[PDB]
mmCIF file with all atom_site columns, all heavy atoms in Angstrom:
data_model
loop_
_atom_site.group_PDB
_atom_site.id
_atom_site.type_symbol
_atom_site.label_atom_id
_atom_site.label_alt_id
_atom_site.label_comp_id
_atom_site.label_asym_id
_atom_site.label_entity_id
_atom_site.label_seq_id
_atom_site.pdbx_PDB_ins_code
_atom_site.Cartn_x
_atom_site.Cartn_y
_atom_site.Cartn_z
_atom_site.occupancy
_atom_site.B_iso_or_equiv
_atom_site.pdbx_formal_charge
_atom_site.auth_seq_id
_atom_site.auth_comp_id
_atom_site.auth_asym_id
_atom_site.auth_atom_id
_atom_site.pdbx_PDB_model_num
ATOM 1   N N   . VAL A 1 1  ? 29.220 -26.764 1.849   1.00 34.11 ? 1  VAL A N   1
ATOM 2   C CA  . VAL A 1 1  ? 30.278 -27.821 1.591   1.00 34.11 ? 1  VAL A CA  1
ATOM 3   C C   . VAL A 1 1  ? 30.044 -28.683 0.406   1.00 34.11 ? 1  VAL A C   1
ATOM 4   O O   . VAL A 1 1  ? 30.854 -29.128 -0.169  1.00 34.11 ? 1  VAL A O   1
ATOM 5   C CB  . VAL A 1 1  ? 30.543 -28.633 2.799   1.00 34.11 ? 1  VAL A CB  1
ATOM 6   C CG1 . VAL A 1 1  ? 31.517 -29.663 2.635   1.00 34.11 ? 1  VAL A CG1 1
ATOM 7   C CG2 . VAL A 1 1  ? 30.796 -27.766 4.009   1.00 34.11 ? 1  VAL A CG2 1
ATOM 8   N N   . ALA A 1 2  ? 28.798 -29.093 0.126   1.00 34.77 ? 2  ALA A N   1
ATOM 9   C CA  . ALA A 1 2  ? 28.448 -29.859 -0.949  1.00 34.77 ? 2  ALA A CA  1
ATOM 10  C C   . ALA A 1 2  ? 28.881 -29.265 -2.276  1.00 34.77 ? 2  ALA A C   1
ATOM 11  O O   . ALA A 1 2  ? 28.399 -28.437 -2.762  1.00 34.77 ? 2  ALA A O   1
ATOM 12  C CB  . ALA A 1 2  ? 26.928 -29.969 -0.977  1.00 34.77 ? 2  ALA A CB  1
ATOM 13  N N   . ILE A 1 3  ? 30.012 -29.993 -2.821  1.00 39.97 ? 3  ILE A N   1
ATOM 14  C CA  . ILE A 1 3  ? 30.667 -29.610 -4.061  1.00 39.97 ? 3  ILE A CA  1
ATOM 15  C C   . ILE A 1 3  ? 29.641 -29.728 -5.251  1.00 39.97 ? 3  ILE A C   1
ATOM 16  O O   . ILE A 1 3  ? 29.056 -30.721 -5.496  1.00 39.97 ? 3  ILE A O   1
ATOM 17  C CB  . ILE A 1 3  ? 31.838 -30.388 -4.404  1.00 39.97 ? 3  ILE A CB  1
ATOM 18  C CG1 . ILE A 1 3  ? 31.608 -31.853 -4.449  1.00 39.97 ? 3  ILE A CG1 1
ATOM 19  C CG2 . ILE A 1 3  ? 32.914 -30.117 -3.399  1.00 39.97 ? 3  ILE A CG2 1
ATOM 20  C CD1 . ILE A 1 3  ? 31.574 -32.534 -5.653  1.00 39.97 ? 3  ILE A CD1 1
ATOM 21  N N   . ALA A 1 4  ? 29.300 -28.536 -5.863  1.00 42.58 ? 4  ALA A N   1
ATOM 22  C CA  . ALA A 1 4  ? 28.420 -28.533 -6.925  1.00 42.58 ? 4  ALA A CA  1
ATOM 23  C C   . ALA A 1 4  ? 29.024 -27.974 -8.162  1.00 42.58 ? 4  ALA A C   1
ATOM 24  O O   . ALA A 1 4  ? 29.650 -26.889 -8.274  1.00 42.58 ? 4  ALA A O   1
ATOM 25  C CB  . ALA A 1 4  ? 27.179 -27.595 -6.638  1.00 42.58 ? 4  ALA A CB  1
ATOM 26  N N   . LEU A 1 5  ? 29.058 -28.889 -9.257  1.00 45.06 ? 5  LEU A N   1
ATOM 27  C CA  . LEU A 1 5  ? 29.783 -28.492 -10.578 1.00 45.06 ? 5  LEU A CA  1
ATOM 28  C C   . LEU A 1 5  ? 28.778 -27.578 -11.250 1.00 45.06 ? 5  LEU A C   1
ATOM 29  O O   . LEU A 1 5  ? 27.822 -27.847 -11.687 1.00 45.06 ? 5  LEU A O   1
ATOM 30  C CB  . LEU A 1 5  ? 29.984 -29.858 -11.400 1.00 45.06 ? 5  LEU A CB  1
ATOM 31  C CG  . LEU A 1 5  ? 31.215 -30.681 -11.018 1.00 45.06 ? 5  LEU A CG  1
ATOM 32  C CD1 . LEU A 1 5  ? 31.063 -31.123 -9.535  1.00 45.06 ? 5  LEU A CD1 1
ATOM 33  C CD2 . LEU A 1 5  ? 31.481 -31.642 -11.961 1.00 45.06 ? 5  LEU A CD2 1
ATOM 34  N N   . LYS A 1 6  ? 29.333 -26.313 -11.503 1.00 45.33 ? 6  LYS A N   1
ATOM 35  C CA  . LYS A 1 6  ? 28.683 -25.237 -12.254 1.00 45.33 ? 6  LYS A CA  1
ATOM 36  C C   . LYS A 1 6  ? 28.458 -25.679 -13.696 1.00 45.33 ? 6  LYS A C   1
ATOM 37  O O   . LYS A 1 6  ? 27.304 -25.744 -14.184 1.00 45.33 ? 6  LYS A O   1
ATOM 38  C CB  . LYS A 1 6  ? 29.478 -23.916 -12.238 1.00 45.33 ? 6  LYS A CB  1
ATOM 39  C CG  . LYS A 1 6  ? 30.974 -24.181 -12.630 1.00 45.33 ? 6  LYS A CG  1
ATOM 40  C CD  . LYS A 1 6  ? 31.210 -23.761 -14.182 1.00 45.33 ? 6  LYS A CD  1
ATOM 41  C CE  . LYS A 1 6  ? 32.555 -22.981 -14.215 1.00 45.33 ? 6  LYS A CE  1
ATOM 42  N NZ  . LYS A 1 6  ? 32.473 -21.846 -15.142 1.00 45.33 ? 6  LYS A NZ  1
ATOM 43  N N   . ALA A 1 7  ? 29.504 -26.205 -14.398 1.00 42.92 ? 7  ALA A N   1
ATOM 44  C CA  . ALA A 1 7  ? 29.240 -26.607 -15.859 1.00 42.92 ? 7  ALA A CA  1
ATOM 45  C C   . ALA A 1 7  ? 28.639 -28.088 -15.878 1.00 42.92 ? 7  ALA A C   1
ATOM 46  O O   . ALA A 1 7  ? 28.136 -28.497 -16.945 1.00 42.92 ? 7  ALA A O   1
ATOM 47  C CB  . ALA A 1 7  ? 30.742 -26.641 -16.439 1.00 42.92 ? 7  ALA A CB  1
ATOM 48  N N   . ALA A 1 8  ? 28.747 -28.787 -14.694 1.00 42.99 ? 8  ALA A N   1
ATOM 49  C CA  . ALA A 1 8  ? 28.115 -30.124 -14.652 1.00 42.99 ? 8  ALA A CA  1
ATOM 50  C C   . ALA A 1 8  ? 27.024 -30.094 -13.623 1.00 42.99 ? 8  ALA A C   1
ATOM 51  O O   . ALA A 1 8  ? 27.169 -30.710 -12.540 1.00 42.99 ? 8  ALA A O   1
ATOM 52  C CB  . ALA A 1 8  ? 29.184 -31.130 -14.392 1.00 42.99 ? 8  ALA A CB  1
ATOM 53  N N   . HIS A 1 9  ? 25.969 -29.545 -13.764 1.00 43.47 ? 9  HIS A N   1
ATOM 54  C CA  . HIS A 1 9  ? 24.787 -29.507 -12.943 1.00 43.47 ? 9  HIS A CA  1
ATOM 55  C C   . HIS A 1 9  ? 24.257 -30.886 -12.581 1.00 43.47 ? 9  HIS A C   1
ATOM 56  O O   . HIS A 1 9  ? 23.501 -31.517 -13.287 1.00 43.47 ? 9  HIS A O   1
ATOM 57  C CB  . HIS A 1 9  ? 23.612 -28.614 -13.397 1.00 43.47 ? 9  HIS A CB  1
ATOM 58  C CG  . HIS A 1 9  ? 23.944 -27.137 -13.602 1.00 43.47 ? 9  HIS A CG  1
ATOM 59  N ND1 . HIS A 1 9  ? 23.831 -26.489 -14.854 1.00 43.47 ? 9  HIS A ND1 1
ATOM 60  C CD2 . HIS A 1 9  ? 24.452 -26.253 -12.874 1.00 43.47 ? 9  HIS A CD2 1
ATOM 61  C CE1 . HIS A 1 9  ? 24.314 -25.222 -14.731 1.00 43.47 ? 9  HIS A CE1 1
ATOM 62  N NE2 . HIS A 1 9  ? 24.610 -25.098 -13.437 1.00 43.47 ? 9  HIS A NE2 1
ATOM 63  N N   . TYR A 1 10 ? 24.753 -31.500 -11.367 1.00 43.23 ? 10 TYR A N   1
ATOM 64  C CA  . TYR A 1 10 ? 24.331 -32.705 -11.077 1.00 43.23 ? 10 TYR A CA  1
ATOM 65  C C   . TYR A 1 10 ? 23.715 -32.794 -9.738  1.00 43.23 ? 10 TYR A C   1
ATOM 66  O O   . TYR A 1 10 ? 23.050 -33.782 -9.366  1.00 43.23 ? 10 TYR A O   1
ATOM 67  C CB  . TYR A 1 10 ? 25.459 -33.710 -11.055 1.00 43.23 ? 10 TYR A CB  1
ATOM 68  C CG  . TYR A 1 10 ? 26.476 -33.507 -9.617  1.00 43.23 ? 10 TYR A CG  1
ATOM 69  C CD1 . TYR A 1 10 ? 26.540 -34.556 -8.812  1.00 43.23 ? 10 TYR A CD1 1
ATOM 70  C CD2 . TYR A 1 10 ? 27.127 -32.360 -9.448  1.00 43.23 ? 10 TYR A CD2 1
ATOM 71  C CE1 . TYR A 1 10 ? 27.234 -34.463 -7.598  1.00 43.23 ? 10 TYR A CE1 1
ATOM 72  C CE2 . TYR A 1 10 ? 27.820 -32.300 -8.287  1.00 43.23 ? 10 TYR A CE2 1
ATOM 73  C CZ  . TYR A 1 10 ? 27.943 -33.314 -7.422  1.00 43.23 ? 10 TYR A CZ  1
ATOM 74  O OH  . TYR A 1 10 ? 28.611 -33.164 -6.259  1.00 43.23 ? 10 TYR A OH  1
ATOM 75  N N   . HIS A 1 11 ? 23.830 -31.754 -8.999  1.00 45.16 ? 11 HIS A N   1
ATOM 76  C CA  . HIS A 1 11 ? 23.287 -31.651 -7.696  1.00 45.16 ? 11 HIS A CA  1
ATOM 77  C C   . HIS A 1 11 ? 22.303 -30.215 -7.542  1.00 45.16 ? 11 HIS A C   1
ATOM 78  O O   . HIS A 1 11 ? 21.335 -30.255 -6.948  1.00 45.16 ? 11 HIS A O   1
ATOM 79  C CB  . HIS A 1 11 ? 24.384 -31.561 -6.498  1.00 45.16 ? 11 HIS A CB  1
ATOM 80  C CG  . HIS A 1 11 ? 23.873 -32.098 -5.292  1.00 45.16 ? 11 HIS A CG  1
ATOM 81  N ND1 . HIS A 1 11 ? 23.959 -31.453 -4.141  1.00 45.16 ? 11 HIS A ND1 1
ATOM 82  C CD2 . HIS A 1 11 ? 23.361 -33.277 -4.969  1.00 45.16 ? 11 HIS A CD2 1
ATOM 83  C CE1 . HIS A 1 11 ? 23.429 -32.211 -3.144  1.00 45.16 ? 11 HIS A CE1 1
ATOM 84  N NE2 . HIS A 1 11 ? 23.104 -33.269 -3.583  1.00 45.16 ? 11 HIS A NE2 1
ATOM 85  N N   . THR A 1 12 ? 22.880 -29.216 -8.154  1.00 44.67 ? 12 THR A N   1
ATOM 86  C CA  . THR A 1 12 ? 22.179 -27.962 -8.263  1.00 44.67 ? 12 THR A CA  1
ATOM 87  C C   . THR A 1 12 ? 20.917 -27.971 -8.967  1.00 44.67 ? 12 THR A C   1
ATOM 88  O O   . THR A 1 12 ? 19.852 -27.578 -8.579  1.00 44.67 ? 12 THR A O   1
ATOM 89  C CB  . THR A 1 12 ? 23.058 -26.798 -8.723  1.00 44.67 ? 12 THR A CB  1
ATOM 90  O OG1 . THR A 1 12 ? 23.170 -26.917 -10.262 1.00 44.67 ? 12 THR A OG1 1
ATOM 91  C CG2 . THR A 1 12 ? 24.520 -26.948 -8.230  1.00 44.67 ? 12 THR A CG2 1
ATOM 92  N N   . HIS A 1 13 ? 21.039 -28.658 -10.224 1.00 45.51 ? 13 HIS A N   1
ATOM 93  C CA  . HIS A 1 13 ? 19.937 -28.772 -11.143 1.00 45.51 ? 13 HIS A CA  1
ATOM 94  C C   . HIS A 1 13 ? 19.471 -30.141 -11.137 1.00 45.51 ? 13 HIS A C   1
ATOM 95  O O   . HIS A 1 13 ? 18.102 -30.350 -11.289 1.00 45.51 ? 13 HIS A O   1
ATOM 96  C CB  . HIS A 1 13 ? 20.280 -28.179 -12.534 1.00 45.51 ? 13 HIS A CB  1
ATOM 97  C CG  . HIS A 1 13 ? 19.047 -27.933 -13.327 1.00 45.51 ? 13 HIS A CG  1
ATOM 98  N ND1 . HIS A 1 13 ? 18.103 -27.199 -12.903 1.00 45.51 ? 13 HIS A ND1 1
ATOM 99  C CD2 . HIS A 1 13 ? 18.700 -28.454 -14.614 1.00 45.51 ? 13 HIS A CD2 1
ATOM 100 C CE1 . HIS A 1 13 ? 17.175 -27.017 -13.838 1.00 45.51 ? 13 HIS A CE1 1
ATOM 101 N NE2 . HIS A 1 13 ? 17.535 -27.731 -14.921 1.00 45.51 ? 13 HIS A NE2 1
ATOM 102 N N   . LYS A 1 14 ? 20.301 -31.147 -10.969 1.00 48.45 ? 14 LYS A N   1
ATOM 103 C CA  . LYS A 1 14 ? 19.884 -32.520 -10.852 1.00 48.45 ? 14 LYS A CA  1
ATOM 104 C C   . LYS A 1 14 ? 19.757 -32.992 -9.398  1.00 48.45 ? 14 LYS A C   1
ATOM 105 O O   . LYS A 1 14 ? 20.718 -32.978 -8.531  1.00 48.45 ? 14 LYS A O   1
ATOM 106 C CB  . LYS A 1 14 ? 20.920 -33.479 -11.492 1.00 48.45 ? 14 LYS A CB  1
ATOM 107 C CG  . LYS A 1 14 ? 20.460 -34.106 -12.813 1.00 48.45 ? 14 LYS A CG  1
ATOM 108 C CD  . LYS A 1 14 ? 19.923 -35.491 -12.477 1.00 48.45 ? 14 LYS A CD  1
ATOM 109 C CE  . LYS A 1 14 ? 20.369 -36.463 -13.453 1.00 48.45 ? 14 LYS A CE  1
ATOM 110 N NZ  . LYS A 1 14 ? 19.658 -37.781 -13.361 1.00 48.45 ? 14 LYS A NZ  1
ATOM 111 N N   . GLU A 1 15 ? 18.541 -33.500 -9.069  1.00 49.52 ? 15 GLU A N   1
ATOM 112 C CA  . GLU A 1 15 ? 18.239 -33.959 -7.745  1.00 49.52 ? 15 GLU A CA  1
ATOM 113 C C   . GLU A 1 15 ? 18.600 -35.459 -7.595  1.00 49.52 ? 15 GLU A C   1
ATOM 114 O O   . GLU A 1 15 ? 19.808 -35.869 -7.769  1.00 49.52 ? 15 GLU A O   1
ATOM 115 C CB  . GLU A 1 15 ? 16.805 -33.841 -7.392  1.00 49.52 ? 15 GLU A CB  1
ATOM 116 C CG  . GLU A 1 15 ? 16.481 -32.800 -6.277  1.00 49.52 ? 15 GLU A CG  1
ATOM 117 C CD  . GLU A 1 15 ? 15.276 -33.147 -5.416  1.00 49.52 ? 15 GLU A CD  1
ATOM 118 O OE1 . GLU A 1 15 ? 14.395 -33.905 -6.044  1.00 49.52 ? 15 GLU A OE1 1
ATOM 119 O OE2 . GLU A 1 15 ? 15.034 -32.489 -4.329  1.00 49.52 ? 15 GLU A OE2 1
#
């Protein structure tokens, strides 16, 4: 459910 921006890695790559 956690929306993760592909072009804007703020959760996937950014902790």
